[PDB]
Amino acid sequence: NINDALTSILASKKYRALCPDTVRRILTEEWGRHKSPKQTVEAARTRLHGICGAVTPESLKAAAAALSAGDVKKALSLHASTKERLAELDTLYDFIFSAETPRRVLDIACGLNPLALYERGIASVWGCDIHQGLGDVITPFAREKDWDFTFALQDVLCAPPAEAGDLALIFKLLPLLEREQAGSAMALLQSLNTPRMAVSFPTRSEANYAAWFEGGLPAEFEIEDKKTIGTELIYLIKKNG
């Protein structure tokens, strides 16, 4: 059954750090394609491969090493998403925090971005992602710095973020979610317990993310700002209600 397959996949070195719900989610969808378990499992592994960033145990090790040496910039360069943001990092957050600087930030599908929030003096951060390796990198650092950061191994398509905050960051995530499950992107934004959010899209290929987002954003949200900074198209939105 699905549970047996989940147990076998989580025992492998390649996927042992993946969120169990993620493995089950993919397994369940593949099982719906009725197949000899052989086939099902193999189709699931093929999908799990590129579910976190196509992100290795080696990259995470290096990240923690650089972090343990106080080299935050180097750690950020060890994760593809934060590395490509390095050049305009401060320009980006000056934009997001221009109006108000949040006391508590929720980083949805955080990757290693929380490290950038630390250097920005953000007091409280809660981040969630599907690879424990990410939390294994940030958590020990936060502890040393006596920084209030918490990591949750959580698949947002299985359980929405339950935490409350002043601002939520949803960087380079909606495209992936929407492709995994239609309508899940806007559903996620509605589930966030924050009055404001910052959403970003990659500029490389919803062929047109701007048209998709502006035309599909639920009525309870209002777009207050839209700007392209570096490799990202960012939207500052307000959730009313």
* CB nearer to ligand SAH: pick between 41 and 89: 89
Residue among 96, 156, 198, 229 that touches ligand SAH (CB under 6 A): 156
Residue among 66, 172, 229, 237 that touches ligand SAH (CB under 6 A): 172
- On whether 164 is known to bind a ligand per the annotation, the reply is no
Residue 81 Cβ vs ligand SAH, minimum distance, rounded to whole Å: 3
Q: Is 76 in the site for ligand SAH (CB under 6 A)?
A: no
Q: Report strand pairing: 232-239 vs 221-229.
A: antiparallel
- On whether 12 is known to bind a ligand per the annotation, the reply is no
Look at the block and give the residue holding tokens 């934004």: 189
Residue 53 Cβ vs ligand SAH, minimum distance, rounded to whole Å: 5
* CB nearer to ligand SAH: pick between 131 and 196: 131
Subset of residues 99 to 138 that bind ligand SAH, contact rule: CB under 6 A: 109-111, 113, 129-131
Amino acid identity for residue 52 in this structure: C
Q: Is 92 in the site for ligand SAH (CB under 6 A)?
A: no
- On whether 84 is known to bind a ligand per the annotation, the reply is yes
- On whether 94 is known to bind a ligand per the annotation, the reply is no
User: SS3 letters for the chain?
Assistant: CHHHHHHHHHCCCCCCCECHHHHHHHHHHHHCCCCCHHHHHHHHHHHHHCCCCCCCHHHHHHHHHHHHCCCHHHHHHCCHHHHCCHHHHHHHHHHHCCCCCCCEEEEECCCCCHHHHHCCCCCEEEEEECEHHHHHHHHHHHHHCCCEEEEEECCCCCCCCCCECCEEEEECCHHHHHHHCCCHHHHHHHHCECCEEEEEEECCCCCCHHHHHHHHCCCCEEEEEEEEECCEEEEEEEECC
- On whether 79 is known to bind a ligand per the annotation, the reply is yes
Take residue 1 and report the two structure tokens written for it: 């059954």
Residue 179 Cβ vs ligand SAH, minimum distance, rounded to whole Å: 10
Amino acid identity for residue 34 in this structure: H
* CB nearer to ligand SAH: pick between 5 and 52: 52
Residue 154 Cβ vs ligand SAH, minimum distance, rounded to whole Å: 6
- On whether 109 is known to bind a ligand per the annotation, the reply is yes
Q: Is 63 in the site for ligand SAH (CB under 6 A)?
A: no
Exposed/middle/buried for residue 136 (C-beta within 10 Å: 0-12, 13-18, 19+): middle
Q: Is 171 in the site for ligand SAH (CB under 6 A)?
A: yes
- On whether 199 is known to bind a ligand per the annotation, the reply is no
Residue among 2, 10, 157, 217 that touches ligand SAH (CB under 6 A): 157
The annotated binding site is made up of 79-85, 109, 129, 154-156
**Which residues make up the interface to ligand SAH (CB under 6 A)?**
52-53, 81-82, 109-111, 113, 129-131, 155-157, 171-173, 176
